[PDB]
Design a protein around this ligand. Structure first.
Ligand SMILES: CCCCCCCCCCCCCCCCCC(=O)OC[C@H](COP(=O)([O-])OCC(O)COP(=O)([O-])OC[C@@H](COC(=O)CCCCCCCCCCCCCCCCC)OC(=O)CCCCCCCCCCCCCCCCC)OC(=O)CCCCCCCCCCCCCCCCC
Ligand SMILES: CCCCCCCCCCCCCCCCCC(=O)OC[C@H](COP(=O)([O-])OCC(O)COP(=O)([O-])OC[C@@H](COC(=O)CCCCCCCCCCCCCCCCC)OC(=O)CCCCCCCCCCCCCCCCC)OC(=O)CCCCCCCCCCCCCCCCC
Ligand SMILES: CCCCCCCCCCCCCCCCCC(=O)O[C@@H](COC(=O)CCCCCCCCCCCCCCC)COP(=O)(O)OCC[N+](C)(C)C
Ligand SMILES: CCCCCCCCCCCCCCCCCC(=O)O[C@@H](COC(=O)CCCCCCCCCCCCCCC)COP(=O)(O)OCC[N+](C)(C)C
Ligand SMILES: CCCCCCCCCCCCCCCCCC(=O)O[C@@H](COC(=O)CCCCCCCCCCCCCCC)COP(=O)(O)OC[C@H](O)CO
Ligand SMILES: CCCCCCCCCCCCCCCCCC(=O)O[C@@H](COC(=O)CCCCCCCCCCCCCCC)COP(=O)(O)OC[C@H](O)CO
Ligand SMILES: CCCCCCCCCCCCCCCCCCCC(=O)O[C@H](COC(=O)CCCCCCCCCCCCCC)COP(=O)(O)OCCN
Ligand SMILES: CCCCCCCCCCCCCCCCCCCC(=O)O[C@H](COC(=O)CCCCCCCCCCCCCC)COP(=O)(O)OCCN
Ligand SMILES: CCCCCCCCCCCCCCCCCCCC(=O)O[C@H](COC(=O)CCCCCCCCCCCCCC)COP(=O)(O)OCCN
Ligand SMILES: CCCCCCCCCCCCCCCCCC(=O)OC[C@H](COP(=O)(O)O)OC(=O)CCCCCCCCCCCCCCCCC
Lengths: 144, 108, 546, 443, 152
């Protein structure tokens, strides 16, 4: 080690290479290239604008997942107790399984049918008659 | 030992100067003739195609063979997806009139 | 303290590779690297005592959500439970001593701070791998240690064989990475989540365990994937110690122990075949680092079989991983000191005597070698005997053959490790360079790993140490006799006249040569067909001359 | 619309500047592309993500040319407005500035049009500009220009009568009423497949790309790779899937086998390439094949994942073209045998090359990793083997990527010096975009 | 008939022409779909775009339901520790059912039906075991599992 120890002074002064190949001429400050103010203004104003889009827009306006997160929570609140009551009523469960059989679903898909009471196919099928008429009644006594 | 800048900036071209200026072409490569010839030949390799025995055999077993293998695999995946989704047999191109496009108002 | 075990080696790497290091130099960067590892080790010690002993897991939401499209939801979240605390303690403790060693071993290298920053990045991505709570942040750690392994294996880039070794490691692991990705797709599709605590599988579709096993066989260098591991000796000695002890090769075993969704027949067969193969491979090598590399492959085979045995076997597999890291890193550091004392020579025919090394290097090689061969009441004795006794009472008939393969492997290991000591120190001198290293930093680096070897005996890895699986004295004390047989054979230095078996085994069964033409040359030739015959030929449309 | 007229008229004033004022010409042409980047960022600010699928609509009477914004068009428009000032930094003549300004007008109006005849008019009005850009007299290639123009014209001429067939069938080419009427989907589906399978390089109509993307200048290569290939993908997502969905189901085995063989055969060809620009040029075909199969899967969130892969490719491959362009500009060759040891002589350029190599191979912390994972989720949900084909062939992409990097970057140090400030700032917006979109892409 | 279809189209066009809504309500996030007996809903474009907006709303809500249930199940399993096998089966079942609804409703034209519980597979195994019993041959298939995952 220089100086005879690890804890001595360093041994280099001056430029350790030239960044971007730029060498100072007569000690003058580096002259600004023609594109630099416009590049920094354009790309910096794009970056700040993208930041403000992510951090200052209203959350519902930024992403639809913020519109649907509170509406899913209340539906889940009124569906958890429906699923609780289904685990206590065997007659309602066997009627739900009969409706599942009519809708080409299997017995394990009984929880799924409760969770899809607001779907487009279920509402339109209740309207058209493809869905059995009992499913609306089962939803009514499961919500009650 | 050229001087392409004044002491206050101000690039000079050095058109009539004796010393060779450093510029854009300073680090251009010295071309090896055989490397240039090989790259030229590989650039125009479509002139070397010929329907001999080996070309025909490899174009049959690898190009046509793997194209047919991929078509068979695609049809297999399509049919298995339709079976595992509760659909009947579905009409691909050239397959007689059948079901295409499941209805969202229908339970399968 | 919990996030300090993961962030802070990454911070040390960021400091030593950025233009901040232009102001520190070699001298300042060595200080930065060693301090940034000491802090992370202290944090991991606190985490280990809290989670392993007092049983309180900690879950941290670090950087919000990574990406969430549909029901595919990947979050920047960690969870620190028993396996994670075990792995963090092991990785940071080994990497601290390897950093302290590398700051003196690579002192005369021109780019020392770049090397130290690469070591720190490699350690930090390993910490990210084991600290993750879901599969995608685990994949960040997986590919991060893959990339840093590429950067560190091919560090001496002006040497072509080092560059080709790094490319080979990337490509061999890329095959298994593809299979692991397809397995992650299977797991998420049929369970609905990516987090480990929601992945409880009783009966899945077969492709899950097989593809995750193939992805683990890549990183843990099992049979038909071991080919990259021996060529990774082109890198410097600290790289080899950190690859073979704490990072990279232990990641696949960790993944299989964590998930526990394998099918045991494949796992047991792959592990026992790997153990026997790497045992016979290391018995016929003369390169000092290649013998230790093959012993690493053999012990990974042992751990693979153990996690095949069951949940208790999974615990024994993690225990053998934890105790293996310490003496394997110690073996590599002592071998590096012996190599530097002998003028860079790596052939064991050019060693001998007790002049080219310090007393502490010889003691380190002796103690780590005794732990590796299962000498009684040392660190490897407990874990290796636990795996062997668990394999002797398994009710699967497949495990009967696996146990025999493991016992043969144990005798081979005690043969070639004793040969490594015998050639290095006991025989007459046959080199010509005697420059023994007695610096403070590598000696303290070795002493720390020997302290961890003592710690594993005093404080066990888990509760299995001291539990008695009830076996007769003949079955129980046979591995001690196999260790003694290996020692006696290697000190007698006897050889056989069956030279064709010797050259079949010493050339490592020709796996690399057969792979050079069974997939590789066909890939090149099919590329020739698709370009010349297809793009320039069959599909090419010419001009109309007029 | 009034803003767009003002931006066009400001851009067209570059011709009226006298050529002896060099600084003013440079600054005016650079600002003329900076302003649309600000306007498209403002359009992203104005977008309501919980509102309608089509926002900011405008229709120009009975002239076709109707416009609207959805998510795919908005992301692609943002990427184009980023890419065009970088092209402005790589040109030196007023002819180049004007060609790229006209190309930017045509691309931006084509990305958000809602009329099929309007899409036809706006897109391939760029054909003669591409011919002149690629076949430039001293340093281009007229063979490549002829190939790209003739392939594009062939596909467009197949589409044009089917366009007019649905127009006579229902009475309009507006996509909102074309999707709600009864039309003969096989004929129109074949016409749309004919254009968009040439725009996206799908085998066998893919041979124009290796010639054109290499014979182009660096700015032309940045535009052609990062932008113009994605017009086929947005063609699929905007016009073909909504209007002819029965065809889009029935052609799935054929489109599937075309995508699989394009991916495999183009990856196999990339390994034998000896030109760095040809290596970068082939790798784009496999990525577009994955994009096309993810679009055609229609399975989980297919539009999202496929658009995200289009953005990740459009960020990563122009940067590789930029690094190859630097090497060619200051060494006058693109041949691998002339380059070795570039780590010792260009450390910053080699570091950028390594990072974008890792990005092109879909490693994590790059947007390609998230993109390929979600594209394979969309592919996996139809069948597991169609995902397995792409999964097991990952060694083949890494082979060519690491082989090219290891051949040109390590070894004996020979070659040009490291990058300038201008070259670094041509690269830099793509790197920042990659780090953001690969670490925290969404909120 | 054609006259009735035409008069219905005129009524729909008049209604959607003179439509307004305020006070915190977004149009194109409608509360209810429009119920119709039309063959091919795309016959009436306003009804098609309305029900398209409603269906988009439902898909995003189901994704959100999956995320809320996954957080709840994580809380249960991490609190339970080694007791998770008998304590948090019900919440795991509800999470798997929500994922099943999020994937299988409005799935597209090509994707197969996703079983998060291996429930279709084990139901098929039950039916094939019953068929092989009446066939009176050996079952070439596995016996059906009682539960395959931590939920189902
Ligand atoms: C591991 C190292 C790899 C390379 C070395 C090959 C060793 C193979 C071998 O058989 O060597 C015996 C070899 C005898 O060969 P040899 O001395 O050249 O030949 C015998 C004499 O000519 C004359 O000797 P002899 O006639 O007096 O009898 C000696 C020999 C029997 O010699 C014979 O006459 C051969 C007849 C065969 C049946 C008896 O006895 C046996 O081998 C019986 C089994 C013990 O033993 C040694 O002297 C070498 C000892 C080194 C360790 C080997 C101990 C056994 C290890 C078991 C695991 C096997 C791992 C290899 C996997 C294969 C791939
Ligand atoms: C009427 C055609 C006009 C449009 C094309 C045009 O202008 O071509 C001029 C141009 C005339 O060039 P040439 O200097 O007279 O050379 C004639 C071929 O190279 C002839 O060379 P060759 O001896 O290789 O030709 C045999 C030809 C076998 O020829 C055929 O396959 C003809 C069947 C075409 C009927 C469609 C079904 O096989 C192939 O070249 C590969 C299989 C073609 C698929 O034709 C070509 O560039 C080749 C046309 C091949 C069509 C398939 C292209 C695959 C994509
Ligand atoms: C099909 C959906 C569109 C997704 C395309 C992929 C975008 C790539 C990047 C992913 C970013 C995700 C951003 C999420 C929040 C942003 C706002 C948002 O919601 O996205 C917009 C659109 O998002 C964008 O436009 C994202 C822009 C991404 C492009 C980024 C690349 C350009 C930057 C280049 C680098 C610049 C660096 C400069 C600094 C020096 C609408 O999409 P959806 O939410 O699906 O629309 C809802 C549908 N409906 C109205 C019917 C209810
Ligand atoms: C010039 C006057 C005649 C122009 C008629 C053009 C008809 C179509 C010809 C083929 C299309 C070519 C379009 C290229 C546009 C970009 C370009 O290069 O512009 C030119 C000039 O192009 C224009 O005329 C621009 C104005 C017209 C477009 C903008 C206004 C209307 C929209 C820039 O000047 P130079 O190329 O240096 O001119 C030298 C001429 N020569 C090649 C022959 C050596
Ligand atoms: C909280 C963390 C803060 C930072 C902690 C890390 C800094 C300590 C290590 C300092 C850099 C190591 C290199 C070094 O100092 O080299 C010398 C080695 O110094 C040592 O004595 C060893 C370093 C100190 C002990 C190890 C500290 C590391 C921390 C872990 C401790 C674990 C126990 C070289 O020998 P010398 O200077 O003593 O002799 C000079 C020579 O003979 C004449 O030229
Ligand atoms: C022949 C002419 C050349 C080719 C045709 C060009 C057609 C004009 C470009 C596309 C016009 C629609 C822009 C996209 C959009 O969403 O615009 C709306 C939003 O306006 C904008 O913010 C427009 C931004 C324009 C720039 C963004 C890129 C689009 C195309 C760029 C063209 C110019 C690029 C210059 C490049 C040098 C419309 O605003 P409005 O008030 O007119 O409509 C509201 C209402 O319906 C009343 O009619
Ligand atoms: C400087 C970047 C600081 C981090 C910003 C960040 O991660 O934001 C992300 C968007 O990125 C950005 O907004 C990056 C834009 C600027 C480019 C890089 C400079 C996501 O935003 P978040 O998750 O913090 O948003 C939550 C509120 N909804
Ligand atoms: C070329 C490859 C280079 C590889 C680099 C290393 C590998 C990196 C791999 C992972 C990269 C992830 C980086 C993510 C950046 C920020 C993303 C989050 C943005 C954000 O607004 O989040 C908040 C920011 O918090 C914070 O950030 C914490 C607040 C400040 C306190 C700690 C300061 C950081 C010290 C780090 C030392 C060095 C570590 C080096 C990695 C946290 O809140 P949230 O909104 O997510 O809420 C949830 C919990 N509250
Ligand atoms: C000279 C070469 C002889 C090789 C055998 C090793 C020495 C064993 C001596 C012996 O006959 O011991 C028997 C061990 O056999 C057994 O019942 C055990 C067979 C397997 C033992 C292999 C490991 C030996 C330990 C090293 C009897 O055993 P005992 O009646 O003395 O045993 C109860 C007291 N502890
Ligand atoms: C790209 C390559 C990727 C593939 C890599 C390796 C994959 C190996 C796969 C080997 C097995 C594939 C599947 C075949 C067995 C399953 C069978 O599914 O059913 C088939 C499939 C399924 O039948 P189905 O499920 O009963 O409808 O059968 C068909 O419908 C297709 C039968 C004809 C297939 C060949 C047609 C001729 C194409 C010629 C292409 C050559 C053009 C050359 C131009 C230059």
């Amino acid at each position: 080690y220089p100086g005879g120890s690890f804890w001595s002074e360093g041994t280099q002064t001056g430029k350790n290479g030239f960044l971007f190949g730029e060498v100072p001429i007569n000690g003058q400050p580096r002259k600004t290239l023609w594109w630099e103010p416009y590049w920094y203004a354009g790309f910096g104003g794009m970056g700040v604008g993208v930041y403000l889009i992510y951090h200052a827009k209203p959350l519902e306006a930024l992403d639809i997942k913020y519109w649907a997160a509170p509406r899913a929570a209340k539906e889940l609140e009124t569906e958890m107790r429906m699923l609780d009551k289904l685990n206590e009523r065997p007659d309602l469960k066997e009627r739900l399984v009969a409706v599942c059989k009519d809708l080409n679903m299997i017995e394990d898909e009984a929880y799924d049918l409760v969770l899809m009471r607001n779907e487009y196919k279920v509402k339109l099928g209740m309207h058209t008659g493809r869905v059995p008429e009992d499913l609306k009644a089962i939803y009514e006594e499961l919500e009650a | 030992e050229a001087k392409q800048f004044t002491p206050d900036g101000k690039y000079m071209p050095g058109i009539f100067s004796k010393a060779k200026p450093l510029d854009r072409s300073t680090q251009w490569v010295h071309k090896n003739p055989y490397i240039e010839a090989w790259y030229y030949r590989r650039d125009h390799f479509e002139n070397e195609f010929v329907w001999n025995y080996r070309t025909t055999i490899e174009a049959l077993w690898f190009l046509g063979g793997f194209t047919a293998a991929a078509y068979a695999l695609s049809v297999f995946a399509f049919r298995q997806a339709d079976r595992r989704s509760g659909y009947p047999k579905r009409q691909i191109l050239g397959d007689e009139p059948a079901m295409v496009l499941p209805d969202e108002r229908q339970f399968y | 303290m919990f996030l300090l075990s993961v962030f802070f080696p990454l911070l040390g790497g960021l400091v030593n590779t950025s233009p901040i290091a232009r102001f520190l130099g070699h001298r300042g960067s060595s200080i930065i690297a060693i301090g940034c590892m000491v802090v992370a080790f202290i944090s991991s010690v606190v985490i280990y005592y809290e989670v392993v002993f007092m049983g309180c897991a900690v879950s941290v939401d670090v950087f919000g959500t990574w990406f969430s499209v549909g029901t595919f939801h990947a979050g920047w979240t960690f969870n620190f439970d028993l396996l994670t605390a075990n792995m963090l303690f092991t990785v940071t403790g080994v990497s601290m001593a390897v950093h302290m060693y590398a700051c003196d071993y690579m002192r005369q290298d021109p780019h020392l701070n770049l090397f130290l920053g690469y070591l720190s990045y490699f350690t930090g991505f390993m910490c990210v791998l084991v600290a993750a709570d879901n599969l995608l942040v685990m994949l960040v750690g997986w590919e991060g240690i893959g990339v840093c392994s590429y950067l560190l294996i091919g560090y001496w880039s002006h040497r072509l064989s080092a560059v080709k070794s790094a490319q080979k490691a990337i490509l061999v692991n890329r095959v298994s990475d593809g299979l692991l990705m397809w397995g992650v797709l299977w797991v998420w599709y049929h369970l609905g989540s990516l987090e480990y605590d929601l992945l409880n599988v009783y009966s899945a579709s077969g492709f899950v365990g097989l593809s995750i096993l193939i992805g683990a066989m890549g990183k843990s260098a099992q049979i038909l994937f071991h080919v990259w591991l021996a060529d990774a000796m082109e890198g410097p000695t600290p790289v080899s110690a950190l690859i073979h002890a704490a990072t990279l090769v232990t990641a696949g075993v960790y993944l299989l122990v964590r998930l526990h969704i394998h099918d045991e027949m494949f796992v047991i067969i792959v592990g026992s075949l790997t153990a026997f193969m790497a045992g016979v491979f290391g018995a016929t090598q003369s390169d000092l680092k290649r013998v230790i590399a093959y012993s690493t492959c053999s012990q990974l085979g042992y751990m693979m079989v153990s996690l095949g045995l069951g949940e208790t076997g999974g615990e024994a597999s993690m225990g053998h991983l934890m105790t293996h890291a310490s003496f394997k890193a110690a073996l590599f550091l002592a071998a590096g000191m012996v190599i530097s004392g002998n003028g860079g020579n790596q052939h064991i025919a050019r060693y001998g005597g007790s002049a080219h090394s310090a007393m502490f290097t010889m003691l380190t090689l002796m103690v780590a070698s005794l732990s590796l061969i299962g000498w009684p009441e040392l660190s490897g004795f407990y874990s290796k005997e636990t795996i062997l006794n668990l394999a002797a009472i398994c009710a699967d008939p497949i495990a009967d053959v696996a146990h025999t393969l493991l016992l043969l492997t144990a005798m081979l290991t005690s043969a070639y490790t004793t040969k490594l000591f015998y050639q290095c120190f006991m025989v007459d001198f046959s080199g010509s360079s005697v420059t023994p290293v007695r610096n403070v930093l590598p000696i303290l680096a070795m002493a720390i790993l020997l302290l961890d070897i003592m710690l594993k005996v005093w404080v066990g890895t888990n509760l299995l140490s001291g539990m008695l699986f009830f076996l007769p004295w003949g079955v129980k004390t046979l591995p001690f006799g196999l260790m003694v047989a290996g020692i006696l054979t290697a000190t007698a230095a006897v050889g056989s006249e069956r030279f064709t078996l010797i050259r079949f085994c010493g050339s490592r069964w020709g796996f690399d040569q057969l792979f050079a033409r069974s997939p590789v040359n066909p890939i090149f030739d099919l590329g020739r067909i698709t370009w010349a015959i297809g793009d320039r030929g069959l599909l090419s449309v010419g001009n109309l001359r007029a | 619309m009034f803003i767009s007229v003002l931006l066009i008229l400001f851009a067209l004033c570059v011709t009226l500047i006298p050529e002896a004022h060099y600084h003013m010409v440079r600054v005016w042409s650079f600002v003329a592309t900076i302003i649309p980047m600000w306007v498209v960022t403002w359009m992203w600010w104005n977008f309501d993500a919980s509102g309608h699928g089509l926002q900011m609509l405008v229709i120009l009477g009975r002239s076709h040319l109707a416009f609207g914004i959805d998510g795919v068009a908005l992301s692609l428009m943002l990427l184009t407005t980023v890419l065009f000032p970088i092209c402005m930094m790589l040109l030196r003549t007023v002819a180049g500035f004007m060609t790229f300004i006209l190309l930017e007008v045509l691309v931006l109006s084509a990305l958000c049009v809602l009329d099929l005849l309007g899409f036809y008019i706006l897109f391939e009005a760029s054909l003669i500009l591409l011919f002149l850009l690629i076949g430039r007299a001293p340093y281009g290639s007229l063979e490549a220009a002829y190939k790209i123009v003739l392939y594009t014209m062939a596909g467009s001429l197949v589409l044009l009568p089917t366009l007019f067939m649905i127009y006579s069938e229902c009475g309009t080419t507006n996509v909102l009423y074309m999707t709600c009427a009864y039309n003969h989907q096989t004929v129109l589906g074949w016409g749309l497949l004919a254009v968009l399978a040439v725009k996206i390089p799908l085998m066998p109509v893919h041979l124009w790309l290796p010639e054109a993307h290499v014979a182009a200048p660096t700015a032309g290569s940045v535009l052609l790779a990062g932008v113009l290939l994605k017009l086929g993908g947005i063609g699929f997502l905007r016009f073909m899937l909504p209007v002819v969905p029965e065809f889009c189901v029935s052609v799935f085995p054929l489109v599937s086998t075309l995508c699989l063989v394009s991916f495999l055969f183009s990856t196999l060809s990339t390994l034998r390439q000896i030109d760095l620009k040809k290596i970068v040029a082939y790798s784009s075909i496999a990525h577009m094949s994955m994009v096309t199969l993810a679009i055609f899967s229609q399975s989980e969130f297919s539009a999202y994942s496929s658009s995200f892969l289009m953005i990740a490719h459009g960020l990563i491959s122009p940067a590789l073209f930029l690094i190859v362009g630097i090497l060619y500009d200051r060494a006058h060759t693109k041949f691998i045998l002339y380059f070795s040891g570039l780590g010792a002589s260009m450390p910053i350029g080699s570091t950028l090359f390594f990072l974008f190599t890792l990005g092109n191979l879909a490693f994590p912390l790059f947007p390609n990793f998230i993109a390929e994972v979600l594209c394979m989720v969309s592919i996996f949900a139809v069948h597991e083997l169609l995902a397995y084909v792409f999964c097991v062939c990952q060694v083949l992409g890494a082979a060519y990527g690491f082989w090219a990097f290891n051949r040109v970057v390590h070894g004996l140090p020979r070659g040009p010096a490291d990058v300038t400030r201008t070259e670094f700032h041509t690269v830099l917006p793509l790197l920042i975009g990659a780090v953001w979109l690969g670490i925290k892409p969404m909120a | 008939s054609v006259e009735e279809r035409q008069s219905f189209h005129d009524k729909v066009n008049d209604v959607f022409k003179n439509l307004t809504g305020e006070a915190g309500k977004r149009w194109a996030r409608p509360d209810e779909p429009i119920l119709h007996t039309l063959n091919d809903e795309k016959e009436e474009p306003h009804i098609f775009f309305h029900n398209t907006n409603y269906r988009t709303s439902r898909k995003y809500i189901n994704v959100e339901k999956t995320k809320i249930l996954r957080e709840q199940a994580l809380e249960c399993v991490r609190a339970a520790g080694t007791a998770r096998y008998h304590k948090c089966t019900e919440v795991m079942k509800r999470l798997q059912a929500a994922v099943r609804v999020a994937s299988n409703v409005d799935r597209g034209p090509l994707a197969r039906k996703r079983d998060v519980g291996f429930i279709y597979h084990n139901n098929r195994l039950r039916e094939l075991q019953q068929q092989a019993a009446e066939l009176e041959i050996e079952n070439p298939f596995p016996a059906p599992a009682k539960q395959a995952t931590g939920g189902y």
